[PDB]
Design a protein around this ligand. Structure first.
Ligand SMILES: OC[C@@]1(O)OC[C@@H](O)[C@@H]1O
Ligand SMILES: OC[C@@]1(O)OC[C@@H](O)[C@@H]1O
Ligand code: NA
Ligand code: NA
Lengths: 266, 266
């Protein structure tokens, strides 16, 4: 087989469809095509696709935001993981989510925010947990108390029909850090429906630098994940495993950077 | 195998991510999993994926906005097509794109628009050609001259860094019909960057009812494609072909409807 299976939480999140496009490019450079498999952050869908990919004898699997552990132990096909650690013998590639969360706090604080909310991601996403921890560590360094709201899912179309309890109070914050750009878009939509002015009344920073942050208005200040470097790295390492080349099985963490746009003041 | 290959022409476009999610649900109801294959509206990528899916002996293929023809002749795997016709012995499922184009014209005209632009899709998309023809036939019935601008691609992230020549003149139109909702979002972003008020200065209608129109602000008036009915139908018909059950090979066209939101005046 010259096909690699890429498991995607959902390509409805712009970040994952862009990642899938760029991984496909790097795979093509190495002579591979891709099958994309939608796992929807569901352990049983992931298990099913692992079985289906194995039965189809793909050359390798890229496992994004995995919720398994067990299931991977016997599979005899090369695997690399994006974000979530699976087993100690599978390489995990990620952005520097801890430091990105610190950068997000430092940016809001530098822009004068003192009443701060972090809309954090589901606990099962190692990446969002690290963003939360970096943000909180930043607040602790400034002796600032922060409020949290924890979403239980990444973006789903149903989110557009869901309310936040006490949405009327959100405008009272100086700044809000939202765990990713697509979730930030939903938060800004809710604020706009209530007539809230951004950034005049509240400042917003997201995470990813996915296309949704530039597509909408005002454009979203965010933390860049380096999709090209992530995709390059994932494919380079998977091909080493496929080829039986030596590589230390350890974390590969790519640098992030602040992208200042119109939802924070300057 | 119990796997169906779904060719996806634009994994960046909300409409196709939502279609893929719903097709997956209906396939699961019938006992099938899906592999998604990114064709990127490229004939060579489609040809490649067709070969890869055949080599993997999938149970059936859902072609989507296909640009091939003879490559499908005697591939001995069941195929159904979304939108673009492939061969006379392959069923094509689509929304009622001609009537949706007429509905879009009628709605702008009823809201008082007389200086009207249609940003039309690539000529290789049968669906957008029919939207253009329905819109134009509506204009001709009212003895109204319409202007056209023809995009050569569906949404790509690079569109966010591309300008329309004479963009500063677009505000002069009363109303704009854009060939789909994700393209409409890009047009609205350009207008907003220039300080144009929607719908006060220009009214906008898209096509699809994909989730981006409900993230847009103001929310986007559009023509609904019935994703649930499309997905149900694609899977029902593909399973008939797989099972060798009788079915007339003919067009299946699903009804569309206007969804009035905030980018046209109520
Ligand atoms: O949008 C993608 C993302 O930011 O969502 C949360 C995190 O898991 C991932 O990197
Ligand atoms: O967005 C999806 C879509 O509207 O794009 C153009 C048309 O091919 C298709 O139905
Ligand atoms: Na505030
Ligand atoms: Na106008």
């Amino acid at each position: 087989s010259k096909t690699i299976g890429l498991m995607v939480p959902n390509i409805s999140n712009p970040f994952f469809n862009q990642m899938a496009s760029v991984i496909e490019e790097y795979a093509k450079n190495k002579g591979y095509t891709l099958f994309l498999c939608n796992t929807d952050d569901d352990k049983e869908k992931e298990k099913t696709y692992l079985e289906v990919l194995q039965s189809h004898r793909v050359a390798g699997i890229i496992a994004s935001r995995s919720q398994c552990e067990d299931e991977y132990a016997n599979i005899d096909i090369p695997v690399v993981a994006f974000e979530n650690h699976i087993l100690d013998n599978i390489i995990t590639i990620s952005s520097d989510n801890y430091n990105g969360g610190r950068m997000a706090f430092d940016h809001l604080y530098e822009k004068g925010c003192r009443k701060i909310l972090h809309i954090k991601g589901p606990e099962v996403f190692e990446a969002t947990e690290l963003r939360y921890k970096g943000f909180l560590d930043g607040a602790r360094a400034k002796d600032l108390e922060i409020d949290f709201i924890e979403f239980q899912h990444d973006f789903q179309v149903k989110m557009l029909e869901e309310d936040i309890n006490s949405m009327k109070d959100i405008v009272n914050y100086d700044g809000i850090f939202v765990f990713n750009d697509i979730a930030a878009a939903t938060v800004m939509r809710a604020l706009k429906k209530r007539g809230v002015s951004i950034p005049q009344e509240v400042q917003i920073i997201g995470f990813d630098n996915s296309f949704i942050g530039e597509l909408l208005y005002p454009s979203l200040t965010t933390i860049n994940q380096p999709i090209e470097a992530l995709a390059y790295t994932i494919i380079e390492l998977l091909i080493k495993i496929i080829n039986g080349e030596g590589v230390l099985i350890e974390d590969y963490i790519m640098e992030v950077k602040l992208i200042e746009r119109e939802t924070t003041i300057s």
